[PDB]
């Protein structure tokens, strides 16, 4: 009799298109960007994780290849996960909030045509 | 009785320090840089793989 593994495996930081009905959970190893999603048509999104007690600063990130800028800040003692959102190529970077924690984890899923 | 796999597996594009006495073989997926070695002290080497029949650029 073979037993299922308790977890499905710490896979590696790759790009792909995960099918639906599946939670993707991610733990951060470095600072800055953790993951980004997009359909490249009418939906672009990324996140950045920042250490607790960081001052309000504009920072630079190798996002979408072409490095971009945006503001970040965190005062609470938990890590802060700031999302950035865009509905078009010709648009501003709607900086959307958020996920705060000390687990150092993030989670996404596809269902009902909704992320 | 278990047998060895025919080859040690297509591992993933990581950074680390392979110990000695081990060939590291690499196949390229994209264009341009495939890998780089260094010691950050007195040695910095990289490679770039280029498709055949390319102009000097």
């Amino acid at each position, epitope marked *: 009799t073979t037993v299922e593994p308790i977890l499905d495996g*710490p896979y590696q930081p790759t790009t792909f298109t995960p099918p639906n009905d599946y939670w993707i959970l991610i733990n951060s190893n470095t*600072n800055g960007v953790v993951y980004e999603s997009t359909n490249n048509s009418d939906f672009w999104t990324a996140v950045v994780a920042i*250490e*607790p*007690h*960081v001052t309000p600063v504009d920072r630079q990130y190798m996002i979408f290849g072409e490095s971009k800028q945006f503001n970040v800040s965190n005062d609470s*003692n938990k890590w802060k996960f700031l999302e950035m959102f865009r509905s078009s190529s010709q648009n501003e970077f709607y900086n959307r909030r958020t996920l705060t924690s000390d687990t150092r984890l993030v989670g996404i899923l596809k269902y009902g045509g909704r992320v | 009785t278990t047998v060895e796999p025919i080859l040690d597996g297509p591992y993933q594009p990581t950074t*680390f320090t392979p*110990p000695n006495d081990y060939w590291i073989l690499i196949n390229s997926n994209t264009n341009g840089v495939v890998y780089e070695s260094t010691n950050n002290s007195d040695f910095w080497t990289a490679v770039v793989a280029i498709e055949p029949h390319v102009t000097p650029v």
Partner: antibody
Amino acid sequence: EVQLVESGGGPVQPGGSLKLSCAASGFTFSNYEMYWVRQAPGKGLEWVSYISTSPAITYYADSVRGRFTISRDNAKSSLYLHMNSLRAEDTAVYYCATISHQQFSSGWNAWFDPWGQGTLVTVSG
Amino acid sequence: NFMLTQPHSVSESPGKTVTISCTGSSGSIASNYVQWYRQRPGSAPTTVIYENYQRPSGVPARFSGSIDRSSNSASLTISGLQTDDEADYYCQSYDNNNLWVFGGGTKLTVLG
């Protein structure tokens, strides 16, 4: 668990001689480096020696040239320092250790807190 | 090399947040990793932070750290200062060549 053991402490005549030993148990100690650092009041710990996979290459710190000497035994899995005839500043606790930085993935902690307790060695007479 | 200057002492009232820095005179702390070292006079010291912010298991969440790139420094933030925060806190990292670069003994004595 991982264990560092050491020995060789006691009073030391300046201009004298003795031996210091630091063996390790819980890890490989062939793919690691090993150093030594003397700790004392607020001068602070500092680098002493350097051995890393025996290239027939090593390094020494400022106040240890010649009168220290180092040896790294993979078999016994230890560092062996032969000590002679130095200034009284050597009154200190000697520490052996190595921090390892290689990208272990998630799912298991290969991480040490790599510090033996050290050995006290005072220069007196 | 770049020596790692420290505030040779610092304190606040225990029970709130405090910060201790460690600044490299030249070079760049962003070049490689930095690790932090708590120490007691009694027996022997222990590590508190490695890889510049990788908190180690067993040690509580009261500690954390980050890097100021522009000012060439690392820093640590401590929340909920216990009675046994009395310690010394060294910082150290690597040099242009891998031997190490160290910081002065930062004597942390917090009281009111």
